[model samples]
Target: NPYTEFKEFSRKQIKDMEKMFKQYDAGRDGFIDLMELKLMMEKLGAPQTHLGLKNMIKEVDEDFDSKLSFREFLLIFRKAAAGELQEDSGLCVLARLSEIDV
Candidate 1:
């Protein structure tokens, strides 16, 4: 039951990550900025310096403009949940779940 396995994995991951997001989203605007992303990643043991974060933003900047809309963020997150994320994919998938809820 690969589907069940993935569902359970995703559910647990989302639950754990939701807690982190609640903490990192200092402004509580229901959206996370680059700084929040950096901090969250750092706490997860994958610290990214400024340049590293910039490079990551560029990878998912599908338009090459260098900004990540919520949709772009979700795409990256989904790839990650599937264990197929590239360099720019963030470790958190809770944000993507919120998007799907809409």
Candidate 2:
């Protein structure tokens, strides 16, 4: 029920996310850990504090594993579309990525 927000995106957007999920999963462990997420956020230039970053992970980590699976990753985009995250967040960077014209 809480995981249904991704319905707002199109197939292409979801596809882009599928590929990006790997980009953040640099360890290839099939999940994004706190460090990985922090690194990705840094690359996105999102001004995040250590505490805020932890909260961000907590917000989407539905499984309470302190890591993000592919489905949890998609929730980031879902929250982005719903305007639940910050405007200057990494979510903004990803939102632009999916809407960018090549």
Candidate 3:
């Protein structure tokens, strides 16, 4: 039943991400653009170069429209989230998001 246990945790974490996304989605467009992403990191006191930030967006921007929708966020999150959350889930995504070269 441990597998089942994680599902509930995953759901709660997923909702947390959605809520955070909504908090930064000031325009209510359902998409989080570069500027918003910047602010998100700023609030967290995370250090990131402009190029690196864009690279993360490119890696996850499945629609290729140069912006990230909730679906895209979930896409990146899966690899760094439920795909095998061995430890801190969000940090794994954050680290994965930084792996690609700019």
Q: Pick the candidate with the highest lDDT.
A: 2
* Shift in Å, residue 96, candidate 3: 9.9
Q: Give the C-alpha miss distance for residue 80 in model 3, angstroms.
A: 1.0
Alpha carbon lDDT at 62, candidate 2 = 93
**How do the candidates rank by lDDT, highest first?**
2, 3, 1
lDDT of 3 by residue, 1-102 (tens): 322433533555666666777887878998998888777666666745677668768877888887788877665655554554334333354634442211
- Residue by residue across 14-78, what tens digits does model 2's lDDT show? 77777878888999999998898788777765656778778778888999999989888888777
lDDT of 1 by residue, 21-74 (tens): 566676787655678667766765667777767766665667665555444454
Could you give the C-alpha RMSD of every candidate to the true structure, in order shown?
Answer: 7.8, 3.8, 7.6
In angstroms, give how far residue 39 of model 1 lies from its true place: 1.8
TM-score of each: 0.48, 0.75, 0.69
TM-score for model 3? 0.69
Overall lDDT per candidate, in order of appearance? 0.54, 0.74, 0.64
* Number of colliding residue pairs in each model: 0, 0, 0
Task: Rank candidates, TM-score, best first.
Answer: 2, 3, 1
* C-alpha lDDT (0 to 100) for residue 98 of candidate 2: 47
